[PDB]
């Protein structure tokens, strides 16, 4: 994985260059965004279980997905689904903190689509729940932090589709 | 950087970063302006810094530019100066990242295997970075020199110890 | 069922089932008619059984249907009755299989994580299945009640412990 | 894996239904077949080595398969082949006892065809030997149990082809 | 052969063969002419060797060719003689390779499982190879018989154990 | 793996034959080549680091490969490349000693091309370095041993292409 600083450093290193003005401007942007990112990470950590249960209530409960024939039927599958959502929120928070999506490619999305397809986990419904996580999260961390989290939750969704 | 370090530890423990870890990230990110000033000063003064350094290095080790020496002849000597500029550049990366990771992954893992294969004496490299440190820190404020010295020291210690 | 369990043990040990294991299977398979009678009696009387059970449940726990309670309001209360019918159905599966496996895989693994996420009190579920057991066993013969009780008990113990 | 009872239960569960009359009739058939299945399993267990050596004698011995260039040549390959046949008989007996072929899909056939084709194990000759196992088994367990065993030995053969 | 054995050990230890291992290979490769002479002598005399051997074998074990015996009847007896020629052939491979490997991989791993499945007595096979050894060594010089005896002995010992 | 002797034995074994005259002639050739092979193995072992160092200097140093954007840039990749060359030399020496390329198929080339293409390791430059290893080795072990080593170093190159 890389965070936003290592990403800019790597782009320079592979050219054998010191960081130029444009590169330093990218670092300045990330350094200045520190308070935003750290506060949002603290809020999400403190509210992680609530965010997931509210997202599930909005997007999945009382639907076909939780009835026999649906992929959340059986307590075992219900719990597995919740666990997935716990994962997506935690890893999106990592990526938001890092200002970089690489940890998502390396540790979330790698072979995930094939795993779901083999098991019959519905992509459409999963993406709907992640989108619900995005909106619940935004209601708590505010508009500006909500946008950053939205980038990385959207990233996971795009990677599944 | 410091941020990815925290994230890797948290992920290893299947948890969010702790309040303590987040405080540490906050403190790191407010020190950005200083790190950028240091990086630009070293970049701007690369030629001057490398020149002072190489002058001291080959005063101590004239045998490196004598026949049979690894830096004998202009092409080889110029490649040494090239390497010097590269390690100065890696130090600026370390300062910006707040840790040794960008230095280690690009210029230290395998460094002994490389220079041994090139017949460049590793103790010569230890001596080289020592006087690079001297030259570079001399162009910084006292505060900035103290901030920067550990990144040189890490290189020097790495190249000294097996 | 009982048969699968024996086969999994035998396969684990790279062997055929033992004479003892086969005798156990034979004994299980001769008790089929009783198990089918129990399953059909509980199925036929589902509405009556669930009604008796929910009446006792909410006499003990009226707060569940008061404001702020998890079963407050018609849609939520009706979903509780739905769950009740589902656990009764799982008990009939257990009786037919002669073990807890179909109950565990469908209704117990992850059950605490699920109901916690729903804000349904797990001790409430323990109390619910306890009076479900009372209502169901009351419609069976003494012999059949004894056969059926451990399947309810397994659910109750699971929701109580760890 | 599932046995015949769990298979019927699962068909009901995925619909959220109690077992209806047709489902109960399937269970009754399986419960009634208990004596047949248990007796056959005991006979096969007691005679497992004899069944395999007699099948091999009928289908593979004195043929090209056991001469140089054939896949049973060398004592190492001969013994490996016997071991496969031991497997097929034991797992077919499991499936017969369970009244369900799922254990064959999960623990025998999974990746087996690919394994044989990579090793050069002849499918045709393997199927001939399993068919010989079916007929030797039938001679010992009788006509009726022989039919049940035949279903599951045939299942393995179809899975290889 | 002896060569591949050294190479496998070296590879296991991520190293080149040692001076000692190389000397051993050198010594083995200069003994090639002897091994070829032995192999051709046994090949040339196969029919005579197998005939002497089978005569002694069935003088000791006439029950093998009596009713109910594994070698009863011409087709079965001839298959024993076939096997005899095969083990003689494997011994020539062992002599050429300078180790037991070609004998083991073709004729010993799984040999007891095979002959048990065929109802051929493994102690009969031990006795068979014992008199095969006698017949074969009788056609070699003293020196060559000493070189060859261990390959027969390896087969005999393998079939006696486990 | 097989050495030259086991290869000839196997060709006979799969036919159920004693080694004929042509087969014995192959063995005689290998036995007679013993001094050549053992001497070369000793020389290469004693000089393995020098051979690789000199090959790299001839084929890779001061080129695009060792500058930023090239696959040997960074001390980590530089050292990994050297390690690969150490491997190729050691395994070619094994194969030369054995007079057989099977150890190369089994322990070097197996999945190697795919590994390199996934990592972005350049095949062209690797093959150039191995060819340089061939010529340096030949300068030390002589013409005749050089030819044998050349067979197996060329074999590795063909396997990468
Ligand atoms: C919930 C929104 C939906 C749902 C999910 C569901 N997922 C699984 C099983 C798996 N999910 C994962 C996912 C991950 N594992 C990881 O390590 C990571 C990364 C950080 C992820 C994203 C995996 C690997 C599995 C399979 C292995 C396992 O179970 O641990 C299931 C269970 C499927 C089954 O029957 O076994 C389900 C039900 N299903 C829904 O319907 C939802 C919309
Ligand atoms: C100068 C202070 C010392 C010195 C150096 C010297 N180096 C070389 C040749 C090479 N140096 C490198 C260095 C790197 N490759 C990397 O990926 C990195 C990491 C960022 C480094 C530092 C390389 C690859 C070479 C080889 C040639 C090439 O660039 O392809 C020389 C040339 C002579 C030789 O190889 O022996 C020298 C002289 N010599 C000194 O005396 C100093 C102590
Ligand atoms: C009734 C005795 C208790 C009670 C229950 C109650 N449950 C819900 C909501 C849900 N129940 C389930 C249950 C299951 N899903 C399964 O796969 C299985 C296994 C067979 C079960 C048992 C689910 C998924 C829901 C969520 C909605 C949906 O069906 O999608 C409620 C609704 C309100 C809430 O969620 O809090 C209630 C009230 N409440 C009681 O007081 C009783 C002790
Ligand atoms: C005998 C009828 C034929 C024959 C068979 C033969 N098989 C192998 C090798 C393997 N067979 C298996 C089969 C299984 N392994 C399992 O765990 C299971 C399932 C429960 C099965 C069915 C496997 C995995 C192998 C490869 C691994 C191993 O050997 O354990 C061989 C040996 C091939 C070789 O040269 O290594 C042979 C000879 N060959 C015939 O000619 C027969 C017709
Ligand atoms: C003769 C000294 C003894 C003897 C032997 C005997 N063998 C058989 C039948 C078979 N022998 C083999 C042998 C091998 N297959 C191999 O791959 C190898 C390794 C090189 C060997 C040695 C086989 C496969 C058979 C089966 C038939 C076939 O060839 O397909 C018999 C036939 C009767 C029987 O099977 O019982 C006999 C009689 N019997 C003796 O009494 C001797 C001690
Ligand atoms: C005995 C068999 C064997 C081989 C052959 C082998 C090769 C080997 N080379 C690798 C990497 C590598 N190989 C090189 C090689 C080079 N890059 C260049 O530009 C050069 C032209 C070249 C040197 C000639 C590089 C740079 C890597 C590192 C790639 C990376 O991780 O970025 C890797 C990936 C894993 C690792 O780094 O250890 C393997 C497996 N490993 C084995 O076990």
From Swiss-Prot, chains A, D, F:
Residues the record lists as N4-methylasparagine modifications: 71
A Pfam short name: Phycobilisome
Keyword terms, alphabetized: Antenna complex, Bile pigment, Chromophore, Electron transport, Membrane, Methylation, Photosynthesis, Phycobilisome, Thylakoid, Transport
Keyword Thylakoid found: yes
SUPFAM superfamilies on file: Globin-like (SSF46458)
Residues annotated to bind (2R,3E)-phycocyanobilin: 81
Gene Ontology CC terms, in alphabetical order: phycobilisome; plasma membrane-derived thylakoid membrane
Biological process according to GO: photosynthesis
InterPro entries noted in UniProt: Allophycocyanin_b, Globin-like_sf, Phycobilisome_asu/bsu, Phycobilisome_asu/bsu_sf
Family as reported in the entry's similarity comment: Belongs to the phycobiliprotein family.
Entry function: Light-harvesting photosynthetic bile pigment-protein from the phycobiliprotein complex. Allophycocyanin has a maximum absorption at approximately 650 nanometers.
Complexes and interactors: Heterodimer of an alpha and a beta chain.
Protein's name according to its UniProt entry: Allophycocyanin beta chain
Organism (species): Synechocystis sp. (strain ATCC 27184 / PCC 6803 / Kazusa)
Swiss-Prot record, chains B, C, E:
GO BP: photosynthesis
Main location group: membrane
Positions contributing to (2R,3E)-phycocyanobilin binding: 80
Topology in membrane: Peripheral membrane protein
Keywords: Antenna complex, Bile pigment, Chromophore, Electron transport, Membrane, Methylation, Photosynthesis, Phycobilisome, Thylakoid, Transport
A Pfam cross-reference name: Phycobilisome
Domain of life: Bacteria
Listed InterPro entries: Globin-like_sf, Phycobilisome_asu/bsu, Phycobilisome_asu/bsu_sf
Sites bearing N4-methylasparagine, chain numbering: 70
Reported modifications of this chain: Contains one covalently linked bilin chromophore.
Location of the protein in the cell: Cellular thylakoid membrane
CDD domains attached to this UniProt entry: APC_alpha (cd12125)
Family membership noted in the UniProt record: Belongs to the phycobiliprotein family.
Subunit structure: Heterohexamer of two alpha chains, one alpha-B chain and three beta chains.
Protein name: Allophycocyanin subunit alpha-B
Organism: Synechocystis sp. (strain ATCC 27184 / PCC 6803 / Kazusa)
Gene this chain is encoded by: apcD
